[PDB]
Amino acid sequence: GEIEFIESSKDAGFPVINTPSKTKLEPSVFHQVFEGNKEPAVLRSGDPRLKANFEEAIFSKYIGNVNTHVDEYMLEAVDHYAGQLATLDISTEPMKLEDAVYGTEGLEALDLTTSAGYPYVALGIKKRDILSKKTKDLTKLKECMDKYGLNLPMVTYVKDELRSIEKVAKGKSRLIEASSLNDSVAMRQTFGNLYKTFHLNPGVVTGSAVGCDPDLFWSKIPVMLDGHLIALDYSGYDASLSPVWFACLKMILEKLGYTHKETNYIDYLCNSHHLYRDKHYFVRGGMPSGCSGTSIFNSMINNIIIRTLMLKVYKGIDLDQFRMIAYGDDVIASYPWPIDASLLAEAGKGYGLIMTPADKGECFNEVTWTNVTFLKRYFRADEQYPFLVHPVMPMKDIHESIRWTKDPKNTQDHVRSLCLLAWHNGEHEYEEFIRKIRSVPVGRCLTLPAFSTLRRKWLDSF
């Protein structure tokens, strides 16, 4: 993706978007009990911790575009992945408005907590001023959609989240680019059934893990992924995507039965208009990170990409023996023969992607079930039930998380969430975690599940 045009918002009649510039993240009561190095991301230019220019840093992800046509390798990659999806009988019929907004099986209700986007944010109008869970009212919404229409600017916010020392210093904060409510709803109507099919079928047919529950899904992955693992990392995947990858996505959507008109929404993602504070800008390429379907579309594109690279480097490849699951940029894949990921990564560079084998800069030279991660988690087969696989979030990441809070009123929910991750590290690890939590008075005021209970509930869930 490439920023094509930027100017002061006022020159175009847009008011300044008044976004949060101070973090909601504060040190929790566990800040001193546990060790950590992470701190809230930089949210504003004047942050004293900056060792770089902030505005340049946050937009540095837009590395440019490769300007090329959909080539023979992409065409065959699209054909192959499209043939997999055809198995699922995805309906291209619009999802009815009530299902698309207030929840149906496979597609949770639209989040009332997130930004309603433009123009609502400039009018002080919130999602709850328009929608109502209790009523399932669509009257105000139909009104707003008629009045303001579709294809509105996306509002860019800086993500308020913990970051490493390096990322704070370099100012590499992430951006969330929020689709207008109108566009969110329209896209959920148009693609809602696709969304639903993907959510209900994580695995190697959708090639997707979006919506998965690692507690259950981790046991299925090694069954699905037969051979030698491939686990390339990307740097700045979303923003690196050039328009040709969006063209590939449109082709696959058309193969599934969507009309050219219904694929128009992909153009809204690719060639996008953003408002950031006092500025507005147009981007060519790049998946906006915060519109409807961004994770699913990112995953579909990753499925096309990896196939393309393998087809391009390994001319004798048999994609019918290839398996992959993606969650956005994150990929775990296998093939029955060793594949040189460094060759794939270099082929990727030719398509404007910045990729590195998972073993690069690590102490090992082969990706295995011992060292592979997916969704930040390791894989560890249970000692007693070897066919069951624990998703293993590093205790370090759990400790980083517990040391801060955006609101201490949620301490019980936050800490319980972390316990559900922590226990997979083993009974000893978990008991020490509990002890330290309980070493602050708040910790003894919390309902914390016992190790035996967590393990018993996990076993029974299968």
Residues near Na ion (CB under 5 A): 272, 283, 286, 330, 339, 341, 359, 362
Query: Toward Na ion, which CB reaches closer, 99 or 359?
Result: 359
Find the shortest distance in angstroms from Cβ 165 to Na ion: 22
104 forms beta bridges with 107
Query: Toward Na ion, which CB reaches closer, 310 or 341?
Result: 341
Find the shortest distance in angstroms from Cβ 98 to Na ion: 30
What is the strand order of the sheet 271-276 is part of?
A: 2-8, 279-284, 271-276, 154-158, 175-178
Do the beta carbons of residue 154 and residue 117 sit within 8 Å? yes
Directed axis angle between helix 294-313 and helix 243-255, to 10°? 100
Find the shortest distance in angstroms from Cβ 233 to Na ion: 6
SS3 category, 223? helix
Q: Which of 70, 91, 80 is nearest to 257 (CA)?
A: 91
Find the shortest distance in angstroms from Cβ 364 to Na ion: 6
Query: Toward Na ion, which CB reaches closer, 330 or 400?
Result: 330
Give the H or E element holding residue 106: none
Which pair of tokens denotes residue 416? 């319980």
Find the shortest distance in angstroms from Cβ 348 to Na ion: 14
233 annotated as belonging to a binding site for a ligand: yes
Query: Toward Na ion, which CB reaches closer, 40 or 288?
Result: 288
Query: Toward Na ion, which CB reaches closer, 50 or 251?
Result: 251
Q: Which of 311, 298, 302 is nearest to 347 (CA)?
A: 311
99 annotated as belonging to a binding site for a ligand: no
Query: Toward Na ion, which CB reaches closer, 91 or 342?
Result: 342
Q: Tell me the C-alpha distance between 68 and 71, whole Å.
A: 8
Find the shortest distance in angstroms from Cβ 152 to Na ion: 14
Residue 316 buriedness (CB in 10 A; 0-12 / 13-18 / 19+): exposed
Residue 341: alpha-carbon gap to chain centroid: 23
**Residues making up the binding site for Mg(2+):** 233, 329
